[PDB]
Amino acid sequence: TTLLNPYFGEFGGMYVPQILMPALNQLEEAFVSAQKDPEFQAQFADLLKNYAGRPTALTKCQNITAGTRTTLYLKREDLLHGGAHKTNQVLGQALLAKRMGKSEIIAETGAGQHGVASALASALLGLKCRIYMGAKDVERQSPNVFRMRLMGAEVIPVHSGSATLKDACNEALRDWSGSYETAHYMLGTAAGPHPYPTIVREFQRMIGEETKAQILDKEGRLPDAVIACVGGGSNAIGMFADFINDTSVGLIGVEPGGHGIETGEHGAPLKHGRVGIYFGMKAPMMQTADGQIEESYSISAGLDFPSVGPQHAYLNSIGRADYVSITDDEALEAFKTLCRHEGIIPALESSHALAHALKMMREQPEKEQLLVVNLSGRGDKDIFTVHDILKARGEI
């Protein structure tokens, strides 16, 4: 028995070993209690405003949309402390861990951004942070590993399985199953077992709440659509959440198309995967014909995850939100275009959402549309990846 519905339609649930169910029940109850506690909301608001930098700006890009009838705004989560939206929910989860009397933090990470976000929240709030990371990702992300250790976190390489994000996800759950009395699992996206999809959404919904108030002040009406990249689903659902009951506002999630859907080397399980049960949830997944969890791919490591949050699968199922894919080359073009015309270096993650917005504008240039793209993070971390690709292609 739970306090909240663990399912979004047929997706979601709490598919963990029996030993972990008390930990999930405790987390749901502490979350429900925190949401009604004004002292918790004041401390959370105090950290978001005076430490993370909220509210973030809503920037109108006039050079980007010249010659068309599209008006494009960027929700500037790239200006958030840490350079990505992840900082929002890790501050909330760290307060939840302290509310439950926990002193240790477990986190998984692949690109390294959630590891950095978990490490800075733990250092600030006096928490011991250990981070599981696939050994392949430890080698790919030497800068982020150093950032985590600079802030006192313990980074533990995971050599089991494919030695990447899904294998770090396993090891965090293995650890948590033997330590949940003293350690909290700071899951890094709006996925996994209930109540994590609900908690991460509510700890990220200020993105959409601010966007609504800001777009109403600047344009006097709601957007025609909000667009966000979907790797696990947290930045997208954070933008979507406050607009879900506004049925005129479109909700567009962008999954990584990788080298192309037809190549099989992508990260779009919601539209091109198959429903399975893994990581504590029933959700679309990239998997073999036998049911082995497949490896996803994207130029953007932050979108490289074989599954997706259950609320996005539900929103797609009922047609409340639409989900598309953007290839590496499309994201790369959007990356270069925003640098040149707006002076903003976007994360390759967020470049996928911008690329689809540029596609909506370019394909129908005389369509009058007010679009908001969630710029989930900055792209300074991606300049080496972009450099080597343009250098190998002779473009530079």
Binding site: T1, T2, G13, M14, Y15, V16, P17, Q18, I19, L20, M21, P22, S160, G161, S162, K166, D167, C169, N170, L173, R174, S177, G178, Y180, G276, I277, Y278, G280, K282, M285, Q287, D290, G291, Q292, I293
Partner: protein, 267 residues
């Protein structure tokens, strides 16, 4: 019906059950079939068999590597069911229990999985990452095909969980020794006497203690504490991993360990 017959015969002999665990196809299909025949010939009362999965999030390094070796052998779930059919044809009375992860049960349809289990003669299915709270469609499909749904009684179980495991479990109750994941190096440090008697009071299926059981004295302590037997996994798999270079010595050491563990079940 095989569990009910086994526990009745063991009760007549004042005996507990020793139930080893191995991953199917580890380190290869042929050697695994020879491994399993050695466990039974050495005195195994029942079998717990895992199907190689890409992400065994309830297993420690020993069984992680067992899934890795079987992956290196190219062992598929379809090949595992052909093994199960041969194992059941070789041993008609020993209870065969599967230890599954949810995706492999859900993949080709929940009902089709348990229908395949019935075709090959499997007696019970435990799904490691499906708690009692999510077990409704899995246990319904199991019972429709005469499969016993196995539920876990963790050491921190409240009274409500005790009643559900007793009311919905069949074949046997998996009595968890400790928190964490599988591993012979870590032993449960909580006396489970109160949970054993509570399960008996609620007419639960006979309890088999698992996780950490690696020595004969642990099997004897489990039987003395009131449990119907004990399950040993990582201790068995370590013998496989230790003797990967000598398949003949692998079977010889498996026979000595299982025979010693089974002898410890005699009260």
């Amino acid at each position: 019906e095989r569990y009910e017959n086994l526990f009745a015969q063991l009760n007549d002999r004042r005996e507990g059950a020793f139930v080893p665990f191995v991953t199917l196809g580890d380190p290869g299909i042929e050697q695994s079939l020879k491994i399993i025949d050695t466990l039974i010939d050495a005195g195994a009362d029942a079998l717990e068999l895992g199907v190689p999965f890409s992400d065994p999030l309830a297993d420690g390094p020993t069984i992680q590597n067992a899934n890795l070796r079987a992956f290196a052998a190219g062992v598929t779930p379809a090949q595992c069911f052909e093994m199960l059919a041969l194992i059941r044809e070789k041993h008609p009375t020993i209870p065969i229990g599967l230890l599954m992860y949810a995706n492999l049960v859900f993949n080709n349809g929940i009902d089709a999985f348990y229908a395949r289990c019935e075709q090959v003669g499997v007696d019970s299915v435990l799904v490691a990452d499906v708690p009692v709270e999510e077990s409704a469609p899995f246990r319904q499909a199991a019972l429709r095909h005469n499969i016993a749904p196995i539920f876990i009684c963790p050491p921190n179980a409240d009274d409500d969980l005790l009643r559900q495991v007793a009311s919905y479990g069949r074949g046997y109750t998996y009595l968890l020794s400790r928190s964490g994941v599988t591993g012979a190096e870590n032993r449960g440090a909580l006396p489970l006497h109160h949970l054993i008697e509570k399960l008996k009071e609620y007419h639960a299926a006979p309890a088999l203690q698992g996780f950490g059981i690696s020595s004969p004295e642990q099997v004897s302590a489990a039987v003395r504490a009131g449990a119907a037997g004990a399950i040993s996994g990582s201790a068995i798999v370590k013998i496989i991993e230790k003797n990967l270079a000598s398949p003949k010595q692998m079977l010889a050491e498996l026979r000595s360990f299982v025979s010693a563990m089974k002898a410890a079940s005699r009260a």
